[PDB]
Design an enzyme around this catalytic site. Sequence first.
Site, PDB file in Angstrom:
ATOM      1  CB  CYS A 267      60.513  45.811  24.174  1.00 26.76           C
ATOM      2  SG  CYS A 267      61.004  46.108  25.890  1.00 26.76           S
TER       3      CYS A 267
ATOM      4  CG  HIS B 212      57.472  50.399  25.865  1.00 27.12           C
ATOM      5  ND1 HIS B 212      56.994  49.108  26.056  1.00 27.12           N
ATOM      6  CD2 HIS B 212      58.801  50.336  25.615  1.00 27.12           C
ATOM      7  CE1 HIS B 212      58.043  48.312  25.893  1.00 27.12           C
ATOM      8  NE2 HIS B 212      59.144  49.003  25.609  1.00 27.12           N
TER       9      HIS B 212
ATOM     10  N   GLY C 247      66.179  46.164  24.916  1.00 29.18           N
ATOM     11  CA  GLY C 247      66.134  45.987  23.469  1.00 29.18           C
ATOM     12  C   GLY C 247      65.308  44.786  23.033  1.00 29.18           C
TER      13      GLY C 247
HETATM   14  C1  LIG Z   1      64.885  53.988  31.341  1.00 28.82           C
HETATM   15  C2  LIG Z   1      63.498  53.499  31.556  1.00 28.82           C
HETATM   16  N1  LIG Z   1      62.454  53.967  30.935  1.00 28.82           N
HETATM   17  O1  LIG Z   1      61.389  53.192  31.470  1.00 28.82           O
HETATM   18  C3  LIG Z   1      61.952  52.352  32.349  1.00 28.82           C
HETATM   19  C4  LIG Z   1      61.117  51.398  33.130  1.00 28.82           C
HETATM   20  O2  LIG Z   1      59.793  51.297  32.591  1.00 28.82           O
HETATM   21  C5  LIG Z   1      59.576  50.504  31.492  1.00 28.82           C
HETATM   22  C6  LIG Z   1      58.247  50.379  31.120  1.00 28.82           C
HETATM   23  C7  LIG Z   1      57.949  49.608  30.015  1.00 28.82           C
HETATM   24 CL1  LIG Z   1      56.305  49.548  29.444  1.00 28.82          CL
HETATM   25  C8  LIG Z   1      58.926  48.943  29.307  1.00 28.82           C
HETATM   26  C9  LIG Z   1      60.254  49.060  29.699  1.00 28.82           C
HETATM   27  C10 LIG Z   1      61.339  48.358  28.923  1.00 28.82           C
HETATM   28  C11 LIG Z   1      61.740  47.063  29.600  1.00 28.82           C
HETATM   29  O3  LIG Z   1      61.255  46.711  30.672  1.00 28.82           O
HETATM   30  N2  LIG Z   1      62.670  46.361  28.934  1.00 28.82           N
HETATM   31  C12 LIG Z   1      63.186  45.116  29.332  1.00 28.82           C
HETATM   32  C13 LIG Z   1      62.459  43.944  29.136  1.00 28.82           C
HETATM   33  N3  LIG Z   1      62.896  42.741  29.531  1.00 28.82           N
HETATM   34  C14 LIG Z   1      64.098  42.684  30.121  1.00 28.82           C
HETATM   35  C15 LIG Z   1      64.887  43.792  30.355  1.00 28.82           C
HETATM   36  C16 LIG Z   1      64.435  45.048  29.970  1.00 28.82           C
HETATM   37  C17 LIG Z   1      65.222  46.285  30.317  1.00 28.82           C
HETATM   38  C18 LIG Z   1      60.577  49.843  30.799  1.00 28.82           C
HETATM   39  N4  LIG Z   1      63.230  52.487  32.445  1.00 28.82           N
END
Ligand SMILES: Cc1noc(COc2cc(Cl)cc(CC(=O)Nc3cnccc3C)c2)n1
Lengths: 304, 304
Positions: B145, B41, B143
């Site tokens: 990830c 992603h 961040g």
């Molecule tokens: C803005 C935005 N773009 O996509 C999304 C939601 O969908 C996704 C889909 C995927 Cl495969 C990955 C992510 C990144 C994520 O989830 N990061 C994360 C990990 N652990 C704790 C906190 C955070 C923020 C978002 N919002």
Amino acid sequence: SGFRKMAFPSGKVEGCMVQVTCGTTTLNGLWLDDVVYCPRHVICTSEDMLNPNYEDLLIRKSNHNFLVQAGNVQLRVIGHSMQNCVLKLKVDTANPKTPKYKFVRIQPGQTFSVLACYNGSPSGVYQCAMRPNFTIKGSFLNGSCGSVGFNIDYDCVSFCYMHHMELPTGVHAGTDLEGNFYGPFVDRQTAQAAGTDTTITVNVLAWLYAAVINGDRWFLNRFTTTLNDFNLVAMKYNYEPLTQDHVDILGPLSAQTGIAVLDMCASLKELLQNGMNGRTILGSALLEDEFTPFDVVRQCSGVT
Amino acid sequence: SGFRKMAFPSGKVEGCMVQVTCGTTTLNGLWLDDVVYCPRHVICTSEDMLNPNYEDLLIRKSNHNFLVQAGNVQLRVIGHSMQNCVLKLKVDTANPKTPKYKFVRIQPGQTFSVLACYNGSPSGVYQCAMRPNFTIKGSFLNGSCGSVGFNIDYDCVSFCYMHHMELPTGVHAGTDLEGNFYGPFVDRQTAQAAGTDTTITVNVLAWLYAAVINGDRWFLNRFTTTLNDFNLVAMKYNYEPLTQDHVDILGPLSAQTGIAVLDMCASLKELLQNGMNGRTILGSALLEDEFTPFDVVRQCSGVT
Ligand SMILES: Cc1noc(COc2cc(Cl)cc(CC(=O)Nc3cnccc3C)c2)n1
Ligand SMILES: Cc1noc(COc2cc(Cl)cc(CC(=O)Nc3cnccc3C)c2)n1
């Protein structure tokens, strides 16, 4: 989101861990520059641990009697001295992996990471707090002596603790890196009182802020309180009195959540007087006090 | 004595953490030999996360579009490929700090250490378990990830997890190092059910053995039970059924304490039916299930 007892990355400290042998005894040492630091009880045998005269015991030792091993290479000892309860072995080689470091004496209520070691080799890393009675609730076995506690500020490792002893009560006692014991403890096999240990109120409050930031808000109520009213509740429950300094230290967490410190205190007061009623806060059924307001800000902001 | 949620020393993993930038997006990468692994992603923008066609999005990218930074030095990318949900960036330089490593897919109920990272820099290390519903209860922010989970067998680092996603429920989902998600999760901004999560019974039992080894014995009783009688209690309390394999896995802990597994099950049964009654076990007011029998043996024996 999510909140865990997070320890500092241990790499910089792993590169400083050595093995120190003196006669029959083997414990861990800390190799920084050309000096290896370790608990002075390394020169003792089980027979003289009841009342050791450390100066006298050190006299019967010479540089060649201290075996320092860094992973597999033997370090040559060109000096030895006793500074309080630590021995300082001057070696002829500076540690190539010495990070930027400081020796600091942490305050009770502050937290640090411990790299538990056996035979100069790290086995694990965990986060813990210096209890108000200056004991630590760690996980240590025979051979763990010399394992260190530290904090990291960007590239600088602040060494705060060196493990020396397990008390019959199961708690752990040790020293700063100048050899001064935290608390009234002595490095000898004798009866030692740990003292009454209270709860770190500013840490419980900071963890309540971490809970709110992380979605857990069931415990938030329609009430408020005063410092003097909250402190009456704190005394009854063996909690450290909350000062204006603590309120100020909780300022960043108050601003981030929009919840005034005294409103959070009223939530804590209700939690203390009524308990959790079978519910959890951040996966816990008890009030956690081993997260400083600094640990909460760091973990919830992602400081590397 | 003492028992803590102990993470593995993180040094060997810290030396593999890099920063990966693709357009506007920046996440962590894992540099092993001449290959950098990171969540796919990284090639997405917020606009196409609703239903991304990853093959199509990868096509619009070239080797020069992937910025890999190892601390401060820029890595030259000579290859890129997608393996399931991970991108594999072939770089022209092998990581000089690559440890002995394996890529393993852990089983639900197993534990591992996570080195949470931001911008290729480690911020902390914590221990956690792959939940029976294949989610992890970690501590991650935007961040994070690309942060990895691992285990250490003497000198060999077994990489088991790569963080990809936070679900709206606050739980964390990710993949093994071949890019296969643990659980039914997909790397797209869509409604995703985590599934019912049960308690890891063999882990709670192992932690009860750790408690006995560490002095906490209040919960031990004059009773015993059968596998079928215990399992009736386990089902009512959303606990994983206990099999003879689990009993055998608890064999070393049974031999070390002299307490038969089924006697320990009767203690667990009483604890489940009556609760702790306000008491604690190893500083906890709830039954802990994120310690395998292996973690207990390792911590209580001092394996480095
Ligand atoms: C803005 C935005 N773009 O996509 C999304 C939601 O969908 C996704 C889909 C995927 Cl495969 C990955 C992510 C990144 C994520 O989830 N990061 C994360 C990990 N652990 C704790 C906190 C955070 C923020 C978002 N919002
Ligand atoms: C045998 C023997 N010789 O002395 C003693 C008791 O007195 C002492 C006095 C001192 Cl200054 C240090 C020690 C080592 C110690 O306490 N290690 C340890 C640390 N953390 C967890 C577990 C263990 C076993 C013993 N038994």
